[model samples]
Target: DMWDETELGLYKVNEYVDARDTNMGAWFEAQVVRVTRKAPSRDEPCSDVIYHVKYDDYPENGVVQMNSRDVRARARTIIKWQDLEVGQVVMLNYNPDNPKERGFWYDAEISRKRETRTARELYANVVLGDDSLNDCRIIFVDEVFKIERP
Candidate 1:
């Protein structure tokens, strides 16, 4: 997806920091206000473009021009929620006994899914193993994670 137009309201993190921060690096979620395709200069012969982004939160910085490499999209996206469906084999971080400690994660297949009465959230009923519980375990779509390959 190289050389594509970066649309507005994109969440990005700074990869190359011109200034120092407390974390020794800066990465912020910002909305893309403007994008500038820059020509190759003596300082940056291989650079392609720059992004004028405004921070909404996380860093609380004003608009800044960043090299294309200096900013990257977030790992998770909104489109992922729409992809969730029944019979999908996904990963889940589940430990119902101890909700505070999210240390256990496992592969689960979605058994059933349905929107609530209000239809504000999408919940997936998933199965972990052979244990046929009286009630299926339900989790929100955002809590679901992709199964990573070895």
Candidate 2:
């Protein structure tokens, strides 16, 4: 996992990760929002730090409306931030080899979802740019470091 946050929000000074994780990570870029530190978890090995985060990719509501009175028709789209869901298409700012630089954008799908409210989210990469979501290509994600939001 290239990008991850703690249960306390993005507040931990040690809550940043810059790694070349080819196993379960892709190159992406995101702005670092607020970060919070939390007590170590029993599940954690005592050196645990967690944060909760809200990304800008998907808006809270997940969709936006477009009005074109001149065209006599309404238009709309699923915002990148709002459209982050299982089976939905999305663009991810992933990391390549440098966390100091911007990563590439990919058209991926929401392969999994959690039922509860928490900062921790797990995603399975479905595809690369323009790749099919039905492809077996997948990446397990439960961790992130650098992040962004508008």
lDDT for each residue of candidate 2 in 1-150, tens digit (9 for 90 to 100): 323334523233332322112223332222233333344466885342322222234336232221111011111233433334566554444444452344544445666655456533535453343333343322223222212221
Best by TM-score: 1
What's each prediction's TM-score? Answer: 0.35, 0.27
Off by over 4 Å in 2: 1-83, 96-102, 115-122, 126-150
Instruction: Please report, as a residue range, the 10-residue window in candidate 2 with the lowest summed lDDT.
Output: 66-75
Weakest ten-residue segment in model 1 by summed lDDT: 15-24
Residue by residue across 1-150, what tens digits does model 1's lDDT show? 223344432333332222212221334446666665534465764425556666555345677666654455432422265677777766554545653355333445666656676653433333344452223454445667664321
Per-model root-mean-square deviation over C-alphas = 12.4, 19.9
Q: Give lDDT per model, in order.
A: 0.47, 0.34
